[PDB]
Every structure is written in C-alpha cells, then in structure tokens.
Design a protein around this ligand. Structure first.
Ligand SMILES: C[C@@H](O)[C@H](N)C(=O)O
Ligand SMILES: C[C@@H](O)[C@H](N)C(=O)O
Ligand code: NA
Ligand code: NA
Lengths: 384, 394
C-alpha cells in the first residue's frame, strides 16, 4: 500500500471492502497459469506484443555520443502503451465475474484504451469525461463511441478531469458488485499503483531481454516521460535492482516552470492527497487541484504516482522537465531522421535523451520508452 | 514479363534502359544474403514484423458460421501493409547506389509510406501528386513533409493521379542514374508487379505459419480487398499452389456497380493499356475517374497478376458497396475493438457474408490491410450527416 510515505487508500469507508476484494483477486490471479495464458494470448495476438527495440542509428550518429535505442510501444494496438494495462485490468475484471468497466479520461486516450479492451472482452463500458474535455477532444470521443463505449459528460465543478474522477468514484461505490473501475495510470488508492505497474512491466522485461541480445549489456540510462507515471514504471521496474542503470523520468515543462503553465508535479508540486493517494500534486494554496498545461494532451494528470515519489526520495531515479518547445523539436527531429512520428508525450523523453546522449561516450547506451505514436497529434502540430 | 496475356512493358523507348537496369539489379539482390539480412532487420526492428494472426472470436460467434481470423497488417509501422513494399524498394534502391526516391500518390497513403522509408534510409524523397489530390488530402501532405519529403503538385492536364504518374515517369527518365521510382502497388511495367508482390508475400508466409500453429491446417478461404492488388497478392501468393485454399479479392462497389461510381476494375472494367501494362482498367478510351468511400481503393486499374488469377479461375473477385464497408467498419470496431481501414473494411464485410454461408470450424483469413485512424474524419461526416432542410443531425 505504501512506497515509503507515499500511497495509501484515501477513500470513503464504503470502498474499503471492494478494494480488499480487488487485491485478494489480484494476488490469486497474477501468477495463475490460466490468467497468464489468456493475458499473454491477447497481448500477443490482439495487441501485437512483443514490440521491437529499435536502434536509432541515424539519430545516434548525428548527435555523436551515446547509442539511442527506442522501445517501440508506438507499435502496440491503439498506438500507446495504455493498452497493456487496459487489457490486464479488463481481463482481471472478467476473471472476477464483472460485466462492466468504468473509467475517467481527460485527453481521451485512456478512455479509448478502456473502450478497446472492453469491446475485445465483451464488457459494457462507460467513460466519465469532463464536459470541457468532451468538447475539445472530438476525435477521441468519436473513437470511444465507435468502440461501443458510452461517454458520460460531467457538467459539474470545473467540467474537467477532477470532476470525472469524482463521478467515477461515486459510480463505483454504487456498482462495484458487477463493475470494475479501470484506473489508467500508476495512481489511485492501493492496489492500483501496484497493479498498473505490474501490467506495464512487460515493457521493461522485453526491453531488458532485447538490449542484452543487441548489445550484450544493460543500458546506462533509461528515459521515459511521466504523466501519472505508468509507461515509466513499466520500463523502469525490471531494472530497479540493476544498480548501474540510471533511470530518468521526464515531466512536462509546458511554457516553462516559471510560467505557471506546466504539469511537473515532482519538480514543482507538493505533497497532498487526491484520487485516493498521498503523493505529489499541483495544488493551490487552498488545497485545490490546479489546472495543468502541456502541448502533449496526455501529460495533463495533476499529480504523479506514489512509486515515483518514492523513487525520487531515495534517489533511485532522477526527474527532469522538458518544455513544449523542446518536445516539438524532438517530434520533428525523430520524424525526419528515423521516419517515426512519436506521440508528443514520448517526444518529451526523446528530447531529453538527445540532450543526454551528447555528453555520454559512444559506447554508452540509452533506451527511450517511445510510449506512443504521433498520428493523434498531427492536428495539434499543424496548428503550431 | 507477363501473367498469361496480362502485364508486359508497354512504354516509350526512354523507359527501356531504366527498367532493364532495375530488372538486372532485382535479379542480383532478391536472393542476396546481405540484402535479405538488412531487409529482415528493418522489417523486424522498425516495421514491427511479424504481425499477429488474430482469431475474431466474438465476431465469429455473432455470425454463427465459419471462424474468422484477421491478419493484422494494421499493426505494421505506419498502419498499413504499404510499408513492406516501401522498405523493400527503398532498400533495393540503396543497394543500387541510388540517393533519391520519387513516387506518385492519389490518396496520399503511398506518398506517406515512401516518405517514411526514405527517412529511415536517409534518402531524398520527392512525391508527385495531382493538385486536386493535394487540396483534398491536407493531412497526408503535412505528414509527408513532416517525414522530410517534398511534395510536388502536378497542375498540368486533369491535376489528378494519371497526371502525377506521367510527371513521375518523366522525372525518372531524366534522373534514373541516382533516382528510384517507387511504385506502390502490383502495377506498372515489368518488373514492378513482380517486385511489389515479392515484397508483400511475407504477409502470406507469416499467415500460413500462423494458421498452421493456431488451427493445425490451412484455411478454407483467404479474403482481401483489392485496389491495385498488393495486399491481396501478398497474402494470396504463398497459397496459390495449395489447391483447396480458396482466394477471394474484394473490389470497391462504391455507390453500386449500376451507379458508375465505383472502382471495380476486374468486375466492370475493360482490358487495355495504362501505366505501361496490359490489365483491366475503368475507361471511357481514356481513364474514367473512380469512386470509393475508401480513399486507397481509387486506382483505376488492377494488377495483371490478378487479371491472370481471375482468368484461370484460381481466384474469385467480388464487390462490396460503400454502405456494406461502413457497416463492417462499425461492426469490427464495437465487436473486437479493432478500428479497420475503410479499404480493409471491404474485405471484412465480404468475410462476414461468407462466414454465414460456411460451416462451424471452417476457417476464413481476412487480410486486415490497415487501421482506420486515418478514416475517422470520413466516417464522422457520414455519422453526423445533416439533411439539406435541417440544421443538426437527426
Ligand atoms: C490524465 C488523463 O488525461 C489520461 N492521460 C487520459 O488520457 O485520460
Ligand atoms: C492509388 C493511390 O491513391 C494509392 N492508393 C496512394 O495512396 O497513393
Ligand atoms: Na503532473
Ligand atoms: Na480499381
């Protein structure tokens, strides 16, 4: 439940037994042969795992320093790593006898992942979304409907993600006997930070095997962007006990840290309680969750998972920021140099790795988690 | 050269020398150990091959007949099978010592695939595109530029695909010493129909291995959509000598075959010469414009190897309408959580009809040639259709 002092279960008493039943089921199924046969089957035949580990040779040689490898989560079905967790939790729900999934979404990206997995497994799917975000995210809202999910606009409060989160929790209180609440990052009350990290750790397990095959050694650095922190935990976790491997998480610096327009909870936030967890959040002087900004739609979550708060505390991982401008430059650079259009989220990681590689020797190795593809971002990048 | 009477090399004398040197290079490299090692390296680590073969269990059980398997080319880097051929030809060009790729594009899909492969291999890329197709494909144009390609609008004549083909061909005659002309389907003068089919046949070889693993036998039927015919040849070719495997190609029926707004060259076209080949084409004696809700089923002809398979009755060719393809697009999305390309939705629609005819435990493989992210704007416009006398969708 706790990663040092971070984490917990800050929920109404009515959710304590549903969370206990979720943990009990998870511990029974996570190493179960039939659960894992089915999970691996869907990850392989529907999602397309394993994803490759790609040597960005042209990019590496241009920069003239460390080798840059990309872990190609952009090739997962749906175009983002979110699918790994959506499948894992949807299958868990089905094994628990649940017939319905709920989730919240801001950018729409987790709503789409949840809708895809629910459709695969024949589950009913309802997605809560702040009405402001519904308005802005026309294409993700349509995708969700096409996939058979019902998008429920949330018109109360500020009509954004915090309000969707509150409605989802209210629904789960009433419907948990048949409904699974599918949390989309390494956030929420225990056991969700643990479960999500476990379902994303396939990224790092593949990457470790792949870099050993390609280079005969472990990487010197792993770089991943951090919203809530799921793609970063997924790639980091299998290397945590390899002391030599540096772990770097990259938060959204937005218009700059001194600008008021970013989403850098670890770098600029403070300890607080939100979404059922004690962690770092961007919160105003009256304890209210602040609006965030990033050019990357999915780096909008106003906090970070407790395991990252912990890794930062113990200095096992370092957390940095990259600006919209730096991310955009990396988006263009990777596209023209390697013929891979990255997600704007992932472009933050690419940007930082490019900076880092310049300083490192040519025999050193950086793996970047390319968490998604950038097709979804083309309208945004055109407008800029 | 030919497939029965079809195919050939009906070109001006200017194109003979570049085609001869291409044929000679392909003979040299096609089975070369180093060429193939590099090709397979890029297909694995950049494109993400192999793609999976997926048992659409929910769709199969809903329809209540034959098993429907999907060959998941939608998962290839770029979201379509075109990538396989783009990489093959771009790498061939590099092994030939070329530094530049040119191509033509209508929908923009082959232009993007060519731009991606050129970016991968550090090659200059120029894409010819009819000015009218440029105006109607703002996103694909941007995408090509983001990938480092230059898009050259063709303003001459009709300002469409036929004109871009002519401009590309003119460029190649002038620049072939250092430029490869990258054709995007199983069309054009020899040796292109053969080369493109060879670079797509990995689809079928994987699918054969995968169905034998999954079901312990070969499929009863393979179904694929047909524009020019490359995704269909790629999945068909390794099964051609497996006598009991039926092969079905699905062309765009558009607004209906009677409507004269379709792209069904095999079903309703006439034999003639265009793009330096003899095949079926939709014509007046000139090329007639085509229609399909699917952008990439717009080529006004069809590859000569399909014309041959049709003639010897090895493969059957059918049509599906816009409306049937849209229904399949929606059905696959909500039943399996896979949003297909509108092109591929034609194959899905036909397979859903065919599966109902067949017995439980018979096996259909559908080539899912691409994903449908690119098509969401098109489908949203139909779904939110506003009647002329209304102010909002009812
Ligand atoms: C934080 C939230 O926006 C998440 N990235 C989603 O797509 O829903
Ligand atoms: C026929 C032509 O439009 C091809 N499908 C392309 O994308 O360029
Ligand atoms: Na944040
Ligand atoms: Na045609």
């Amino acid at each position: 439940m706790w990663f040092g002092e971070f984490g917990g279960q800050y929920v109404p008493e009515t959710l304590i037994e549903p969370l206990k039943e979720l943990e009990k089921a998870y511990k029974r199924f996570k190493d179960d042969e039939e659960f894992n046969r089915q999970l691996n089957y869907y990850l392989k035949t529907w999602a397309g795992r394993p994803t490759p580990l790609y040597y960005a040779k042209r990019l590496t040689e241009k920069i003239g320093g460390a080798k840059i490898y990309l872990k190609r989560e952009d090739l997962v079905h749906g175009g983002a790593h979110k699918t790994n967790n959506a499948i894992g939790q949807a299958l868990l729900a089905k094994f628990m006898g649940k017939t319905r999934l709920i989730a919240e979404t801001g950018a729409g990206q987790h709503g789409v992942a949840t809708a895809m997995a629910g459709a695969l497994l024949g589950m009913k799917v309802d997605i809560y979304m702040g009405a402001e975000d519904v308005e802005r995210q026309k294409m993700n809202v349509f995708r969700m409907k096409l996939l058979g999910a019902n998008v429920i606009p949330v018109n109360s409060g500020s009509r954004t993600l915090k309000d969707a989160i509150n409605e989802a929790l209210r629904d789960w209180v009433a419907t948990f006997e048949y409904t699974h609440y599918l949390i989309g990052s390494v956030v929420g009350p225990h056991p969700y930070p643990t479960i999500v990290r476990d379902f994303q750790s396939v990224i790092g397990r593949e990457a470790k095997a792949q870099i050993l095959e390609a280079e005969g050694q472990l990487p010197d650095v792993i770089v991943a962007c951090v919203g809530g922190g799921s793609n970063a935990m997924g790639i980091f976790y299998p290397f945590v006990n390899d002391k030599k491997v540096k772990l770097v998480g990259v938060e959204a610096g937005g218009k700059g840290l001194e600008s008021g327009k970013h989403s850098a909870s670890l770098n600029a936030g403070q300890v607080g309680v939100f979404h059922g967890m004690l962690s770092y959040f961007l919160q105003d002087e009256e304890g209210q969750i602040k609006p965030t900004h990033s050019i990357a739609p999915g780096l909008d979550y106003p906090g970070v998972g407790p395991e990252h708060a912990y890794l930062k505390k113990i200095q096992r991982a370092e957390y940095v920021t990259v600006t919209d401008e730096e991310a955009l430059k990396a988006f263009h650079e990777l596209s023209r140099t390697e013929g891979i259009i990255p997600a704007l989220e992932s472009a933050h990681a690419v940007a930082y790795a490019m900076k880092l590689a310049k300083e490192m020797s040519r025999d050193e190795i950086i793996i970047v988690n390319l968490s998604g593809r950038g097709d979804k971002d083309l309208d945004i990048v055109l407008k800029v």
